[PDB]
Design a protein around this ligand. Structure first.
Ligand SMILES: [Cl-]
Length: 218
């Protein structure tokens, strides 16, 4: 079933699920540069106007594009050798909302197909998500640790800026589960930090996303 692949050059995403019990579904194509972490993605809704801020899909909308300082990231390594990994992210927001995302990928040569299943609940109807008041997301530093040879934990504090210049805050915990053990040399450099920035242009039915990533032993 699983075959060896290459460093990624192109990708696609099917992201779907529900926010406050209302279904959404988006599909589209992207590209990126595995030598510096950069990604671009276009998504189009297949179920009409999004009923919530498209910014809530950031950061969730491909660490296979992330290099490490002295070679491939474990995420990259697992694509190239084909064995891969699965991802579970939980995010809790300061107003009590929460969001889970589960990812599965398949690989063919330099192309990734991603499936991201989202469940968000508890967003207040007058909050910044359900009122489309999010305008931006801050630079964010993630901390990556390895509790065993098949697991990476990524944690980060997350913030959006609203239309009023307020901060909407959350924390995230992401668990990466590798099919096969990671190389021992990864375990010897803990933690790894990754600094990322995101950009989003959107309508109610389409978005264009960009991400920059840089890992540091620091
Ligand atoms: Cl992450």
């Amino acid at each position: 079933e699983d075959n060896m692949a290459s460093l990624p050059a192109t990708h696609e995403l099917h992201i779907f699920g529900s926010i406050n019990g209302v279904d959404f579904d988006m599909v589209g194509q992207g590209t990126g540069n595995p030598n510096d972490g950069y990604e671009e993605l276009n998504l189009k809704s297949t179920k009409g106007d999004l009923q919530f801020s498209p910014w809530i899909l950031v950061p969730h909308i491909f660490h296979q594009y992330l290099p490490y300082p002295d070679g491939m990231s474990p995420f990259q390594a697992a694509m190239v050798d084909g064995s891969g990994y699965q991802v579970h992210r939980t995010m809790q927001f300061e107003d009590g909302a929460s969001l889970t995302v589960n990812y599965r990928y398949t690989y063919e040569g330099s192309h990734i197909k991603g499936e991201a299943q989202v469940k968000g609940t508890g967003f207040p109807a007058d909050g910044p998500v359900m009122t489309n008041s999010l305008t931006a997301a801050d630079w964010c530093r993630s901390k990556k640790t390895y509790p065993n040879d098949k697991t990476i934990i990524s944690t980060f504090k997350w913030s959006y800026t609203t239309g009023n210049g307020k901060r909407y805050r959350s924390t995230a915990r992401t668990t990466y589960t590798f099919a096969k053990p990671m190389a021992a040399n990864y375990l010897k450099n803990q933690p790894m930090y990754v600094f990322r920035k995101t950009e989003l242009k959107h309508s109610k039915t389409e978005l264009n996303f960009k991400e920059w990533q840089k890992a540091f032993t620091d």
